Design a protein around this ligand. Structure first.
Ligand SMILES: OC[C@H]1O[C@@](CO)(O[C@H]2O[C@H](CO)[C@@H](O)[C@H](O)[C@H]2O)[C@@H](O)[C@@H]1O
Ligand SMILES: OC[C@H]1O[C@@](CO)(O[C@H]2O[C@H](CO)[C@@H](O)[C@H](O)[C@H]2O)[C@@H](O)[C@@H]1O
Ligand SMILES: OC[C@H]1O[C@@](CO)(O[C@H]2O[C@H](CO)[C@@H](O)[C@H](O)[C@H]2O)[C@@H](O)[C@@H]1O
Length: 628
């Protein structure tokens, strides 16, 4: 494989002698040159591990690096300042100062200009991170909520222009808020130019997707493929009008890009540089698990998939150091954590903690949650979890069957219970969720519904508000960057009428994608309403998290409460958090607390608590005790 020095001399060959001389003395080239030397070896290594002796590898690499230079050269000075800032502070993602939020621009604020006007609200809430859902052009009608991309550069006209987006990103930065957007790199819509030209036989786009002449290959692959949306189609393939079959892991209108073609990597890398120069701070790496296929395997989490992601990482270290990756891997816990690494995805969703929060509310038993917090919470240095309560997607019970078996719990039977409970098919359940993708051949099923609908707020369960506070308290204090599903902070319920829209009727996830509720947000400062109670409670926890150093970092140690209903953990050996998942008063004995100071201040309720005697927590009460 070639080296950094050689490649750089060739990149400069596009200039005349006088220009070349000038470029080599510029600060921009100096920085680019240093980063090339430091990070190129990784880029070469990862790419080689995937493409090997592929003839197109070197040519593709030189083209990409040429684009890399032009991209960095054009990169705005403000962004270049951030590049340096994050190079010197890789742990900014681990600061307790960070609190994120996510919303659809259209549902939450109408359009981009409307969103820009909501920025004062985000500052009021205390956000420092904002993820905006798919913003670019997609098919009219059904596009999997924007996840079927028809253009990575043309903004969805209904939202505004690429110009409004630039202003939004600049405004966010002015307010001290990082811009987070999706990098849907595993597939494009079937209306994307690449897909159209590839299917039409354009040699320029040959091998950009996985297309087969018949069911021979598809049938063989399907033997080991997991179905994501079985409601839509079986296996992972869809048939074209001409009879051929195309790999479609998700919806039939979403075609998986073929990364076994180095030109696909180059193409997507170019798109990443485009987003990078808009000022994006974090790219949500959508469906990272599926970017590599291999007959005989599940085609998920394969070695090449990780290598490719690490190659993309190297590209940013070279041409846009400020850009970090947020891994979206909703799979087995042993697989989830493998995507998280300083040289891969610096942060990633923590589906395990999330799913177990809901699990514990249902069972009133923290065994699984405790297990996860004890054995699967801490991460490598310079990386962090993105802890959440809900997202734009359904809830999947992604806990490990192996872990559950250690506790005498049958994973399969347990999920059957959880699914019945959360769709209100279990005596006494307070949840009002909706089924999503019940798979007759596997028994699997997920849950749709807002946090408020799942805790019983729709029917005004008196514990509803407290349940919400409990869930968010854990995501905000366990260690990592907490992500708030905007709307949850005022108790927004389901979009009861989603099933009336023919474009949404077959996707229950829209039940938990309601628009901005004017009535609820208008009540946020009224302590007599559910909206105000939830809002003030979450705002308080956010304020405490950001101002109290005890929450800094992502490391934690669990504390055995000796009460199956109470979760316990310690942050920085100075903050003892307790969470009662029972609707009844629960006690932590004086005996269990012997090692703690006799008195401790509770950051939640603001009172001094005695720890040299039995400590009784009210239903769903949460305590953040400063023990140091
Ligand atoms: O500058 C190094 C050296 O490269 C040569 C080829 O050996 O020319 C290349 O670089 C020039 C300046 O960037 C380009 O104008 C030229 O087209 C390119 O081939 C030498 O001529 C030059 O001394
Ligand atoms: O067949 C799977 C996978 O292999 C690739 C790798 O380039 O194509 C190879 O196999 C094809 C069918 O046998 C050949 O026509 C092709 O020349 C060969 O490189 C991928 O294109 C394909 O997805
Ligand atoms: O149940 C309401 C509504 O949800 C949809 C769309 O997601 O299907 C879900 O519910 C069905 C019945 O429980 C499941 O069989 C299906 O797998 C699940 O996605 C609509 O089809 C249904 O009308």
């Amino acid at each position: 494989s070639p080296n950094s020095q050689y490649l750089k001399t060739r990149i400069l060959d596009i200039y005349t002698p006088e220009q070349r001389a000038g470029i080599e003395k510029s600060e921009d080239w100096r920085q680019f040159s240093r980063r090339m030397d430091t990070h190129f070896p990784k880029l070469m290594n990862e790419l080689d591990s995937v493409y090997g002796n592929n003839e197109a590898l070197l040519p593709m690499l030189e083209m990409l690096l040429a684009q890399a230079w032009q991209s960095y050269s054009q990169r705005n000075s403000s962004l270049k300042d951030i590049d340096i800032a994050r190079e010197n502070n890789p742990d900014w993602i681990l600061s307790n100062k960070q609190v994120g939020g996510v919303c659809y621009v259209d549902l939450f604020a109408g359009d981009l200009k409307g969103l820009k006007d909501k920025i004062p609200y985000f500052q009021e809430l205390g956000l420092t991170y904002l993820h905006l859902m798919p913003l670019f052009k997609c098919p009219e009608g059904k596009s999997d909520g924007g996840y079927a991309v028809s253009s990575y550069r043309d903004v969805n006209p209904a939202l505004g222009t690429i110009g409004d987006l630039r202003e939004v990103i600049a405004a966010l930065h002015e307010a001290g808020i990082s811009a987070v957007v999706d990098f849907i790199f595993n597939h494009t819509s079937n209306e994307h130019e690449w897909a159209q030209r590839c299917a039409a036989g354009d040699p320029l786009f040959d091998n950009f997707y996985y297309i087969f002449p018949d069911r021979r290959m598809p049938d063989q692959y399907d033997r080991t493929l997991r179905e994501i949306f079985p409601d839509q189609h079986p296996g992972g393939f869809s048939q074209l009008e001409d009879g051929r079959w195309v790999w479609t892991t998700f919806n039939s209108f979403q075609w998986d890009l073929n990364y076994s073609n180095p030109w696909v990597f180059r193409a997507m890398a170019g798109e990443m540089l485009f987003l990078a120069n808009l000022g994006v701070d974090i790219l949500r790496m959508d469906a990272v698990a599926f970017i590599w296929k291999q007959m005989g395997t599940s085609c998920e989490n394969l070695p090449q998939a990780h290598a490719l992601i690490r190659a993309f990482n190297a590209v940013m270290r070279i041409a846009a150091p400020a850009v970090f990756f947020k891994s979206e891997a909703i799979v087995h816990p042993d697989q989830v954590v493998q995507y998280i690494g300083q040289d891969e995805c610096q942060i990633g969703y923590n589906p395990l903690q999330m799913a177990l929060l809901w699990n514990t509310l249902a069972t009133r038993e923290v065994n699984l949650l405790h297990q996860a917090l004890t054995y699967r919470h801490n991460l490598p240095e310079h990386t962090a979890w993105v802890n959440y309560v809900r997202s734009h997607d359904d809830i999947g019970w992604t806990f490990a069957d192996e872990d559950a078996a250690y506790l005498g719990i049958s994973g399969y039977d347990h999920r059957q219970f959880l699914n019945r409970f959360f769709v209100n098919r279990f005596d006494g359940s307070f949840a009002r969720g909706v089924p999503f993708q019940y798979n007759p051949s596997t028994g699997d099923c997920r849950v749709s519904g807002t946090a408020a609908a799942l805790v019983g707020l729709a029917q005004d369960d008196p514990h509803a508000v407290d349940r919400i506070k409990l869930l968010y308290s854990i995501a905000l204090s366990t260690g990592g960057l907490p992500l708030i599903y905007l709307g949850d902070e005022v108790g927004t319920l389901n979009d009861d009428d989603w099933s009336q829209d023919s474009n949404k009727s077959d996707d229950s996830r829209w039940a938990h994608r309601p628009r901005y509720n004017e009535a609820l947000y208008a009540q946020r400062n009224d302590p007599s309403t559910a909206a105000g109670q939830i809002y003030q409670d979450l705002r308080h926890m956010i304020a405490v998290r950001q101002s109290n150093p005890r929450f800094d970092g992502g490391r934690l140690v669990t504390f055995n409460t000796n009460n199956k209903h109470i979760i316990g953990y310690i942050r920085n050996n100075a903050l003892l958090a307790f969470g009662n998942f029972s609707e009844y008063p629960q006690t932590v004995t004086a005996h269990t607390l012997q090692a703690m100071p006799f008195k401790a201040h509770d950051l939640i309720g603001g009172k001094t608590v005695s720890l040299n005697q039995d400590l009784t927590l009210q239903p769903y009460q949460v305590m953040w005790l400063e023990i140091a």
